[PDB]
Amino acid sequence: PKPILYYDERSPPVRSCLMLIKLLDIDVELRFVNLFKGEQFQKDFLALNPQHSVPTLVHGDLVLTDSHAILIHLAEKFDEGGSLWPQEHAERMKVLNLLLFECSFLFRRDSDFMSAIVRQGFANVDVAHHERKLTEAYIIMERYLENSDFMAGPQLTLADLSIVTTLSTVNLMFPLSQFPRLRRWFTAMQQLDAYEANCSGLEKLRQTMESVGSFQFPSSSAVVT
Amino acid sequence: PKPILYYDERSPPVRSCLMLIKLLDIDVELRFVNLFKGEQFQKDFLALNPQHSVPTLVHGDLVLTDSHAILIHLAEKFDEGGSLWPQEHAERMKVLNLLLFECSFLFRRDSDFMSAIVRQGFANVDVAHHERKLTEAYIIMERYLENSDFMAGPQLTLADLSIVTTLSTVNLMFPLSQFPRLRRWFTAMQQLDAYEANCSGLEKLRQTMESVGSFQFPSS
């Protein structure tokens, strides 16, 4: 049967999956789970995914609870033999390594910062601490892009779809003026038709965070086309 | 060329890679990076891996900087047709999903806790907060084991190697008596010859964390 995606588009990993669904023209059913209202702790959703997280994909009997497994599964089923999840082993391992960087380093640090805002209120967050941790991720991505125009090589892959949504989220707060390769890449990603799937959720997240955290992001930071 | 593994066996993701190397008889070259001395910030290692993390694998031209990529790469290269990284897609996705749970949930929350000990001193850590966050992970793993003897099904997979090393590290602090499936599974993993590759670095981590956090784990 048709895949079912439990989602809140404020989440950057959710947006990565929405971008791949648009890019590959996949017919999915969308089921909203409001993360800021705690709907992910509702009994039936917890029974399905005890990690209480989105995105969650139900595809037949398969239940996936991590965006990077959802991206790989959808590429294997709906882009078989394609270049997003490369056929050659070394290229595939490079993409996998960059998906794991997104999980373990870029997303972890952005989640630490945004969670602190929700918990503590922006005015009580140690913003300079988080700026250092997230600038460090910008420096690493700039060094990846000094070698190729995409994150994992000369072609668009799943790694770019995973990284661009969290990068756009970090860039609500922290500017990219000192990172010319990351600016060129982000601009290129924003010209993809599939990047439209990032836009609503990024704006919803901006508004929600400003409301819960009682602050404004600096409008000058976000790179816009 | 033979794979090169940059490692500190106190790291649980390192230990998962040491367990797979033993389980598949892989010939690697080990290169020690002392995490508690900050050697992962040395200029040459940072140039190789700017995430300043171990394990890092160099295999020919391929540089992998996450244990879960290293586990998958070594299984594909040295265990084609094995059960650890199943060939059938739905089973492979289930293992991949559990590897990502280990990264994003179990390891994240254990790293948060152990980092707080180093940064604040054990006596100053909000232990009840971390006990809730990590017991949550125990509860989830207990659910995953409902149908099966192993994390991803009836057979040992990469998911079990990834999870057991971090689970053993959490268990320095928080016991398993409430979790019958998890306790049985952990005892079963402890019987594997490959589990010997977890022993040495777990005890080194215990001794290092107890001196540095000026405390004694309850399990010690």
Curated annotation (Swiss-Prot), chain A:
According to the UniProt entry, its GO molecular function terms are:
glutathione transferase activity; steroid Delta-isomerase activity
Gene name of the encoded protein = GstE14
Short name of one Pfam family: GST_N
Q: What UniProt keywords are attached to this protein's entry?
A: Detoxification, Lipid biosynthesis, Lipid metabolism, Steroid biosynthesis, Transferase
Record-stated family: Belongs to the GST superfamily. Epsilon family.
Q: Does the keyword rRNA processing apply?
A: no
The protein depicted here goes by the name Glutathione S-transferase E14
Upper taxonomic lineage = Eukaryota, Metazoa, Ecdysozoa, Arthropoda, Hexapoda
Annotated ranges, domain GST C-terminal: 88-215
Phenotype when inactivated?
Embryonic lethal. Embryos display severe developmental defects such as poorly differentiated cuticle, failure of head involution, abnormal gut looping, and defective mouth hooks and dorsal closure. Trichromes are absent. Embryos have a higher sterol content. Embryonic lethality, defective epidermal differentiation and trichome development can be rescued by supplementing embryos with 20-hydroxyecdysone (20E), ecdysone or cholesterol. RNAi-mediated knockdown results in larval lethality at the second instar stage, which can be rescued by supplementing larvae with 20E, ecdysone or cholesterol.
Looking up InterPro entries in the UniProt record yields: Glutathione-S-Trfase_C-like, Glutathione-S-Trfase_C_sf, Glutathione_S-Trfase_N, GST_C, Thioredoxin-like_sf
